[PDB]
Paper text:
We present here a cryogenic electron microscopy (cryo-EM) structure of the IFI16PYD filament at 3.3 Å, which shows a helical architecture distinct from inflammasome [name] filaments. After extensive optimization, we identified conditions that allow recombinant IFI16PYD to auto-assemble into filaments. The average power spectrum from cryo-EM images of 256-pixel-long nonoverlapping filament segments showed that the IFI16PYD filament is a three-start helix with 134.6° rotation and 5.6 Å rise, displaying no rotational symmetry. Our structure shows that the assembly is mediated by the six interfaces that are commonly found in PYDs and CARDs (Types 1-3 ref.). The Type 1a:1b interface is composed of polar and hydrophobic residues, and Type 2a:2b and Type 3a:3b interfaces include mostly polar and ionic side-chain interactions as predicted previously. Notably, unlike the inflammasome filaments assembled by ASCPYD and its interacting partners, such as AIM2PYD, the IFI16PYD filament lacks the C3 symmetry and displays vastly different helical parameters. Moreover, instead of the six protomers that constitute the filament base of ASCPYD, the base of the IFI16PYD filament is composed of five protomers (i.e., hexagon vs. skewed pentagon). As a consequence, the diameters of both outer and inner rims of the IFI16PYD filament are smaller than those of the ASCPYD filament. For instance, compared to ASCPYD, the short helix 3 that mediates the Type 3 interface protrudes from the center of the protein by ~ 6 Å in IFI16PYD (dotted red circle in Fig. 2Dc). In addition, the loop between helices 5 and 6 in the Type 2 interface also extends from the core by ~ 5 Å due to Pro73 that shortens the helix 5 and lengthens the helix 6 (dotted red circle in Fig. 2Dc). These differences in IFI16PYD would then clash with the ASCPYD-like assembly in the Type 3 and Type 2 interfaces, also causing the Type 1 interface to misalign (red arrow).
Interferon-inducible protein 16 ([name]) is a member of absent-in-melanoma-2 (AIM2)-like receptors (ALRs), which contain a [name] and one or two nucleic acid-binding HIN200 domains (hematopoietic interferon-inducible nuclear antigen with 200 a.a.). [name] acts as a versatile innate immune sensor that detects dysregulated nucleic acids, with its most prominent mechanism of action being assembling filaments on unchromatinized double-stranded (ds)DNA. Upon assembly, [name] mediates a wide range of innate immune responses such as accentuating cGAS-STING-dependent interferon signaling pathways, viral replication restriction (e.g., herpes simplex viruses, cytomegalovirus, and human papilloma virus), and even chromatin dynamics regulation during DNA damage responses.
Numbering used by the authors:
A (entry chain R), B (entry chain N), C (entry chain J), D (entry chain D), E (entry chain H), F (entry chain P), ...: 4 to 89
The structure:
Amino acid sequence: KYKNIVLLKGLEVINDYHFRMVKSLLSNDLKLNLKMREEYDKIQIADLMEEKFRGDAGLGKLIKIFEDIPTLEDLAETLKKEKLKV
Amino acid sequence: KYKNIVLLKGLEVINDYHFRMVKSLLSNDLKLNLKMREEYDKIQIADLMEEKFRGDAGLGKLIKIFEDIPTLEDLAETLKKEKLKV
Amino acid sequence: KYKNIVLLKGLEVINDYHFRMVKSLLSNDLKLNLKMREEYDKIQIADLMEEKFRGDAGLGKLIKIFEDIPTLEDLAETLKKEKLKV
Amino acid sequence: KYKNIVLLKGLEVINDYHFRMVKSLLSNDLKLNLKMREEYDKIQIADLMEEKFRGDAGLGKLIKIFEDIPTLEDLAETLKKEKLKV
Amino acid sequence: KYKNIVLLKGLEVINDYHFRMVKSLLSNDLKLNLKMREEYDKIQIADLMEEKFRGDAGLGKLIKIFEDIPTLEDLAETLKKEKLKV
Amino acid sequence: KYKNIVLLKGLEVINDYHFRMVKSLLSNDLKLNLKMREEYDKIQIADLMEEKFRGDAGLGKLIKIFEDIPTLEDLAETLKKEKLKV
Amino acid sequence: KYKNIVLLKGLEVINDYHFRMVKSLLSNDLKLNLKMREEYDKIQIADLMEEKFRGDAGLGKLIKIFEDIPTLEDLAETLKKEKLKV
Amino acid sequence: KYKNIVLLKGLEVINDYHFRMVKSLLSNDLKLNLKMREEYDKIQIADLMEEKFRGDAGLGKLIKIFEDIPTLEDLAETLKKEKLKV
Amino acid sequence: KYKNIVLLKGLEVINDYHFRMVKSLLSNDLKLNLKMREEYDKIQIADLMEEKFRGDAGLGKLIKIFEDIPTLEDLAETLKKEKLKV
Amino acid sequence: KYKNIVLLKGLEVINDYHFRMVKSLLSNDLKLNLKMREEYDKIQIADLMEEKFRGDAGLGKLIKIFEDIPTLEDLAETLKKEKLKV
Amino acid sequence: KYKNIVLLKGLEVINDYHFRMVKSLLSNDLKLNLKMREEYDKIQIADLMEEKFRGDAGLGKLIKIFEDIPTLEDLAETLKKEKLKV
Amino acid sequence: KYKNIVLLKGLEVINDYHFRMVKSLLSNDLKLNLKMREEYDKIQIADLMEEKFRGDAGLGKLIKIFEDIPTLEDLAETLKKEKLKV
Amino acid sequence: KYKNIVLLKGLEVINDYHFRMVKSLLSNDLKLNLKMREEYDKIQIADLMEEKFRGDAGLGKLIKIFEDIPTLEDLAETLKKEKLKV
Amino acid sequence: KYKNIVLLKGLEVINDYHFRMVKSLLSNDLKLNLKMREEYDKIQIADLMEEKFRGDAGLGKLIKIFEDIPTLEDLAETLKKEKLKV
Amino acid sequence: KYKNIVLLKGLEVINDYHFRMVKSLLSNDLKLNLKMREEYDKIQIADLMEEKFRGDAGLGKLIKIFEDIPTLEDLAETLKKEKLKV
Amino acid sequence: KYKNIVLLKGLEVINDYHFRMVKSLLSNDLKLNLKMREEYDKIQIADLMEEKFRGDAGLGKLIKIFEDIPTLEDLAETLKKEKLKV
Amino acid sequence: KYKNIVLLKGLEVINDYHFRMVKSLLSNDLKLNLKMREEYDKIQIADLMEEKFRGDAGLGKLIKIFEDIPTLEDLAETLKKEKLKV
Amino acid sequence: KYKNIVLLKGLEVINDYHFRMVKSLLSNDLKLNLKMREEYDKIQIADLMEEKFRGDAGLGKLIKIFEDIPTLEDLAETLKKEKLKV
């Protein structure tokens, strides 16, 4: 149920600019070309995360990204709490 | 008559974005491959839920999914009320 | 003459998507297997309803199905008026 | 001569889908069992209508059937004109 | 010679379905019971026409039937041409 | 005179399929072997029924057979009318 | 020797269906009643042909009949060749 | 009288598709070769079943077949009722 | 004894369609005219095989025909086994 | 007495088609020419079998022929029972 | 032998759609009227082609037809190989 | 050989959507009523065009139809080239 | 030839959104029910126009509809030119 | 023709944001659930307006809504002029 | 009784798409040519499997086919249970 | 068993867009005309692959196609694993 | 194999906005009407390039288009490298 | 090729505000309503301009507009150079 956390409590609590920043930061880690960089959305990004990051469905890397963003530090802590719960 | 709740008062009220959300979230619990991710519509998704979630026709898991969606919290409460009525 | 209403003023007025909805929702009430889900058309479905719903030829159950569909509320009212007439 | 109109200008102008639908709608009025619904063609259906509807060879009930069919409304009017002619 | 036209250029140019339809339409005009409806072939039907339609051996009524058959309109014209030839 | 009804207005009105059907259904009641069931025509069948069914010359059992055959229900009614006439 | 062509190379080559065609078409030309049309075989038909058609033993009319039969056009040509030989 | 039911109420009430399926499913129990599989009709199939299933004229096995046929479950129940009547 | 195989295990096991192919493909080898092509039945055809194929009563050519028919390949193998037995 | 079984319980129980089968298959064993093939009836065939098959009056070979006929296997068993009876 | 290729490896390998296409394309070359287009099966069609195309029993024209059908190009090549073999 | 081009390089190369468009556009020129519009396939449509457009078997009119279709301009040019070749 | 203009130069040039607009605006003038709005494609919509708008096959009303759509003003002018030509 | 004004001169002159505002303001008056808020386009909205606002096809309420929006006051005046014209 | 499971509980439950899948996948294992792929229905396919897969009447290979189909996994499990029962 | 992999683990896991890509890229390698582009489904496409790519049943070319599609890289690896297994 | 480059390394790497730009720029060189401007996706557009730009399947013109797009200069260089490779 | 210059070297280089001023200044010359003021992007604007400014695809008036903008004077000179080149 790691995809539930990364999709509901993750990419869908942050705004569009932060989602674009997350996509750009994980473009190399998900092999996102030009089309996927601007066309893919939160559902498709989470599905690709699960497909390529089966260990934790990309929750760890999402938390690491959210740590560096000052606006999303609280959300990173919440995601850490969710991961500890599950 | 649970599938009449998950299909009429459930997947149909939600827009296409939230339906894709649900399909992605329930992909592991419904064994949806790449084709079923984008091809199956609400009728076939509800039928597959009834086939694989015979205990509650997927209504409980749909309500749990809708709880974490800020937009569909009211719909989750309505589905809870419908389930209690049935 | 109840099958006349449920066929010509019923399934024949709704599109293929709503017809698939009706076939799925009445699957338990008509014992439709996988083949009947994707092969039976409006004529066969109406005949099967009349066979298994001899009390009202499935017109009433179709009416409750159409009530929950926001698009077919007017058709549900029309079917109610037709049932009252006959 | 009524059977000439109900066959040549009737069942033989409408397609197979409408022919099956007519056969279903007249199953109770013609006592068609499972074999007759899926086996009888337009010739034998017209003959049975003439046998069991000697008043008008089934032309009138065919016209009332065609009235509710939006596609065959023009053919219903043509059948009315033919009946008025004869 | 009129029986030559109705049997050679007539009932034997049309297929079995059209021959059955002709037999059904002329059932009242030839007093065909159940047996003769599906047992008499083209030879016996033409003989019965000549027996009961001695004015024209049924050629006129066969042409009238063929006129309403869109598939056999050309054959109706050919039969008319042959009749005016003889 | 019951032979006249059962032959002229009976077996001679039904087609070959229904005659073979009657022969099969009356095989036990007429002790028809392999040769008789396949080779005997309507005349010999009526004569044998008169010989073995002297109470009503087989008219009652033929009517009972014709009752259950939907194509021959009208002929069964006609045979009943003939029986009450005679 | 005209009987040999019309019989051995004529009616004895066509099947029973085409022979019944020939018997029916020449019923007026041979004065064949109900029994003669349905009982006479090819030998007696050829004998009656010679009896009533002394000019050519019925070969010319048989060829004319075979001309209009599409299946027997080759046989008609063969009969023409035999007549030219004789 | 068991054959009197399996023919009127059985193989003839079902369509040709179901009759062929019945013939295939009873091929081993009736020793039907290649010819008899698609040459034997309902009358001959019923006669063969009565010959080889003298205990119940094949009514029990026909009911067992009809049961697993979703379309013919009602006919199976009717056959059970008729057997109990006999 | 070879006629016992070509008839009982040969033409009498195949249906009417396969028998018509057999009669057809052997028209040149059996000098079958228009009449014999659709009049001769299995007994007469087998007798003609024995008359004109004294070497093996036509069993070899029948097996060769059955080889190219995919439906009757098993029957061809059975005929080969019977020939090796005798 | 063996002639009684082969005639009364034998050839006279099978139909004309199977009788022609028997005549053709026994043509070599009975020296049946062209005339005897389609002129000798069951009485004459049984008499010739008794004249030529004095060991068992042809009962054994008739049973062997009936074994290969799927329709007459039951009659072959009956003839075997009669032979062991006598 | 050219019939063997055109029938067993020819019209009988293609489905009913392609067979109707062939009958249609050969209607002018075989003089098939309205009846023969919708009634003639593969046996009678092949016999007619041999009768009218004695040079190669219509194998060349069938191969030319099959060339233009993309689905039957492999079958056309196989027929060419068979023709070169024979 | 004009029907060969219109059926092979014509209607068979275009998809079902374009075939339905062609059938609709030629409905007035072919007198296609309601049944033929949704029932006739490419083989029967080509035969009807040849019957009613004997000057060019409908190839020219098909070319003019294909000219206005942007997808089938290349096929229209190919059909023009084929017509110039023949 | 007005339907050739309204279809090829009309509905087939506009995209799906404008086609749905044409269907919706002409719903009252064509009596399109709920099914017909979401099911009928350009071929069937044009055929229905020609059936119900025999004066100009619906070209005038299509042009009037296209006038108010800013995107399709050029197509409206082109259709006006086509109508003036025809 | 009120649907023509509300669609072509109405929702299609306003941009996407104003259309969303119109949909949100008429959510209660049209019973639009969450799916219809974000999925229904101008064609579907106009059709629903005609279905539920048959008095003026929603033109009056659309004009009232446009009055409150300063950007669309000119469009509201134009729609008033169009309503006065029709 | 293995053919009972593979037919009634097997191919008759799947829709036409999955049946075509089964026919294509078993083409090499059943030697189905071009005609057999597009013409055989469930009855004749089941008969062919029983003929060629005598070890398990094709039930095992059908189960392995149904395993890889995500839609028919439940049907594969049901067929496994049926095989274990028998 | 290569066609099993290319169908069940190949085209049946990818959606309609990827399947249209597949058919498109291999149009030259499969000689798919305009009809085959939009009509052939996965079963017919896989059958044509096996017919024209007997070396690997089209599995290898499908793998090279899936390699270039970023969404189907995992499925390409799975197909490579399946090929290595078989 | 140039369609593979223009489709996989080309139009599918670019986002939807750049694909619309490419469709616009190649509209004159591909004769794209109003429908194809907004309806044709990447598969259809690449196929149209192959049909109309057989020299290089439109790869050269696509590269020229990508040169003027600052975002897609790297993709233009990659396409040049692919063309040099193939 | 004037559209390539106006779209790539023109509207694609200027930012959003300059493009909005270009759309506002060209609104009268392009007949853009309220929706087209904001919704239309550079691709659609360039298309429209080609449609209505066929003399130079809008390059001349775009250059004239860019002349008055001090920021885009260099781009205006570059567009003049491109026009002179082409």
